[PDB]
Amino acid sequence: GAMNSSNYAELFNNDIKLFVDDTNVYRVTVHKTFEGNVATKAINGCIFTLNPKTGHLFLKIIHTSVWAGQKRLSQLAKWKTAEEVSALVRSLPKEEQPKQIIVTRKAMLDPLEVHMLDFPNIAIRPTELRLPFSAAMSIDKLSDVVMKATEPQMVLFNIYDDWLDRISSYTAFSRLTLLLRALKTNEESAKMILLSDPTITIKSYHLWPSFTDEQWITIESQMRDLILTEYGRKYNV
Amino acid sequence: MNTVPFTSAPIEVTIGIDQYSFNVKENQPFHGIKDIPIGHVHVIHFQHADNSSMRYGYWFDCRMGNFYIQYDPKDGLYKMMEERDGAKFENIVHNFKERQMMVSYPKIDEDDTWYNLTEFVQMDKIRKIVRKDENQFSYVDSSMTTVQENELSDPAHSLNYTVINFKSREAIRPGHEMEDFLDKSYYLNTVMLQGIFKNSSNYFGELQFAFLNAMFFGNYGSSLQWHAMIELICSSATVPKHMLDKLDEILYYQIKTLPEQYSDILLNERVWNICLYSSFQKNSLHNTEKIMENKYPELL
């Protein structure tokens, strides 16, 4: 059924599963026309498909050419997402195909179910979790590859860098969701926290800085304080 | 004008004949229904006074044989049987007619209701949905499940309606996933009409039979089928004009005949609101929309 706090450890068992988030597939800027009407201009987007156990991220870049001459783009974006996820599954060897796909938005259920009819044994599930994967485009290296793309493209990342050498996937996912929630709530402050110290760098082959174990404790506390501060600045508490 | 005689009425029972119903008391001298119009299928149905559980009945056509009803005290129900001795049957019915022991099919001369509800229903197609080849008439009851229900358990006792499933490979062409899910015209016109039913008359006949089984027996699987066959048409952007006009007439008379007090269990809110107000055909069912809005405005 649906995925919630009661069955949270299921994410880190040995059944292959993928999260799919479609919140950055169809992206626009809204602007005025010469006549004073309003128009949209699409910008490149991406599908965020993540294995929460391994950190493998399948980042399918959605180039703006895919919208050319199409109508009802927000509806189309869900079906395009489902088409690309189905294509990814078919491209994987059988032993690498997921047993479950968890969509972060319920409107992806029917599009994905229909595109996956050939895979009756792959469960398509919603979640009650409010996950912060929309903030993926606040990660500089992910944003950069999406904006520079001149054609459809798939790029593979490990969103956990080398963290699983030292921590479990439960803890790695917890760190990821804290970082993304902070970036979503106050992007400027979160990035200041992650980079304020010039001596800690991001390896060429990583997304996040090379913090020691003790430094990650400090960073995680700072991210919590930020989320809490914003919760106060918001509701005035 | 044909006749379905009864041997007797040993248990108190409400007997229905098409959209009419009447009460017979225990051991009342009752020997059948006469003046049944030739040219239509009919249904004779039963609800026992002591156990309203299980409405049951028989679909039949008097052109196909001489049928009578006899109570079985072992199985505890009124059974339809065929009489093969035609002179015997005529002699029985005549005796009973002369003794005025038979009620009359009460058709008003102006009233086309039963024709309108059964226009496309044909006994030969009923016998393919209800499989019991040794009889010319077909038994249905409240509890019988459909083939589709049995996929999600006695096969011999199933209603073999055509399976409709909007999220199935049958309904969705590879490479046309969005197109076929949002516009079901392929599935309606190529898969179902051209492929399975062969023509719209057979499609409408199954739709009408599903409704009547829902209404007369409270058969849940039949109600599901009726609504699925409506939704498949309304969700298709491309439907022949004569089909839309006929569907409007079919549904109008179904909604007209439905008991006002059964609308809570026999009408699916989501299907009707989508069909009348969101679907491609939201503006094509004028007569149905008007009777629904005046008779069941709460559902909408």
Ligand SMILES: Cc1cccc(NC(=S)NCCO)c1
């Ligand atoms: C055959 C028979 C005998 C008695 C009563 C009925 N029931 C009804 S609704 N008759 C129509 C009332 O205008 C039917």
